[PDB]
């Protein structure tokens, strides 16, 4: 059964919430004892979003190795991702330490620093070339080299320098800037064009460490990115769009980080993204359309 026919049935029955709640009941639960240590309270944005001990990323420092970040290892798809919360004002150094140590080439950001009048993450990268950031706690310097601001996303080139060695590396920052404040995008076209730009950059290739993906909590919008990417990889590897079950893939990813996909709307969106991405790859350009009637509803 094509995913598209499954989607039509779920939409007809209105059963997105039911299917989502079934995934939540079936999801793994593993300990997160390190995350819950008192000394780590100020390293977590939310008390109920924690990395599992088995898959947490460890910082390579002796002081405190903890960061709210998880390694998602998709063995059949042969890709890995690090899912993390948006950095806090006191964890921006830790975030770039992670990027350095894990050898990541790309960072993928799916939120705005400010949304609905609230701080969703710290301003952890420089906005101006001439005003570089120094993270004194982890001995890193970060400079903005260039940016390309497009309608639905921005791509930045950053230089990250290890001040202990003076080694430098180029990091690509892929920033999806147009996720709505409420709900999900009506069409996945722009999010798929984003995804494909990330892939085109080389950042997801096996010569690099895992891409770092975040939103505010690092489970909801972040989960949609990783889920859509891996489902598309599996469709290509099995040479059968129809053998991939997105609910099974999501449950597999939830072995590595709790909570991935946080609403029924996000689950529907991830399905739409994978369907429309597969259709685009197979020759359908119309799924990039977002033609709308003339309206002035605002
Ligand atoms: C050999 C490639 C492989 C297998 C698995 C499970 N992950 N990766 C991988 C792929 C790409 C990146 N950027 C990082 C890691």
Swiss-Prot record:
Membrane topology recorded in Swiss-Prot or TrEMBL: Peripheral membrane protein
Phosphotyrosine modification, residue list: 20, 66
Main location: endoplasmic reticulum
Modified residues (Cysteine sulfinic acid (-SO2H)): 215
Keywords on record: Acetylation, Endoplasmic reticulum, Hydrolase, Membrane, Oxidation, Phosphoprotein, Protein phosphatase, S-nitrosylation
Subcellular location, record wording: Endoplasmic reticulum membrane
PTM annotation (S-nitrosocysteine): residues: 215
Function: Tyrosine-protein phosphatase which acts as a regulator of endoplasmic reticulum unfolded protein response. Mediates dephosphorylation of EIF2AK3/PERK; inactivating the protein kinase activity of EIF2AK3/PERK. May play an important role in CKII- and p60c-src-induced signal transduction cascades. May regulate the EFNA5-EPHA3 signaling pathway which modulates cell reorganization and cell-cell repulsion. May also regulate the hepatocyte growth factor receptor signaling pathway through dephosphorylation of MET.
Name of the protein in its database record: Tyrosine-protein phosphatase non-receptor type 1
Taxon lineage: Eukaryota, Metazoa, Chordata, Craniata, Vertebrata
Shown segment, full-protein numbering: 1 to 298 of 435
């Amino acid at each position: 059964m094509e995913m598209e026919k499954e989607f039509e049935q779920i939409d007809k029955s209105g059963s997105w919430a039911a299917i989502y709640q079934d995934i939540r009941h079936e999801a793994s639960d593993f300990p997160c004892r390190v995350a819950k240590l008192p000394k780590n309270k100020n390293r977590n944005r939310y008390r109920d979003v924690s990395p599992f001990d088995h898959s947490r990323i460890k910082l390579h420092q002796e002081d405190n190795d903890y960061i709210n970040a998880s390694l998602i290892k998709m063995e059949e798809a042969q890709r890995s991702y690090i899912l993390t919360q948006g950095p806090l004002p006191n964890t921006c150094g830790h975030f770039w330490e992670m990027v350095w140590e894990q050898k990541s080439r790309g960072v993928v950001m799916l939120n705005r620093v400010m949304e609905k009048g609230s701080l969703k993450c710290a301003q952890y990268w420089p906005q101006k070339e001439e005003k570089e950031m120094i993270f004194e706690d982890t001995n890193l310097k970060l400079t903005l080299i260039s940016e390309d601001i497009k309608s639905y996303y921005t791509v930045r080139q950053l230089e990250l320098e290890n001040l202990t060695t003076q080694e430098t590396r180029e990091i690509l920052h892929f920033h999806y800037t147009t996720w709505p404040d409420f709900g999900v995008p009506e069409s996945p076209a722009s999010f798929l064009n984003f995804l494909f730009k990330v892939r085109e950059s080389g950042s997801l290739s096996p010569e690099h460490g895992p891409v770092v993906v975040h939103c505010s909590a690092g489970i909801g919008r972040s989960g949609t990115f990783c889920l859509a990417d891996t489902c598309l990889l599996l469709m290509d590897k099995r040479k059968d769009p129809s053998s991939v079950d997105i609910k099974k893939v999501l449950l597999e990813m939830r072995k590595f980080r709790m909570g991935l996909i946080q609403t029924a709307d996000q689950l529907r969106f991830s399905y739409l993204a994978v369907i429309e991405g597969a259709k685009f790859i197979m020759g359908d350009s119309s799924v990039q359309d977002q033609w709308k009637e003339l309206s002035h509803e605002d």
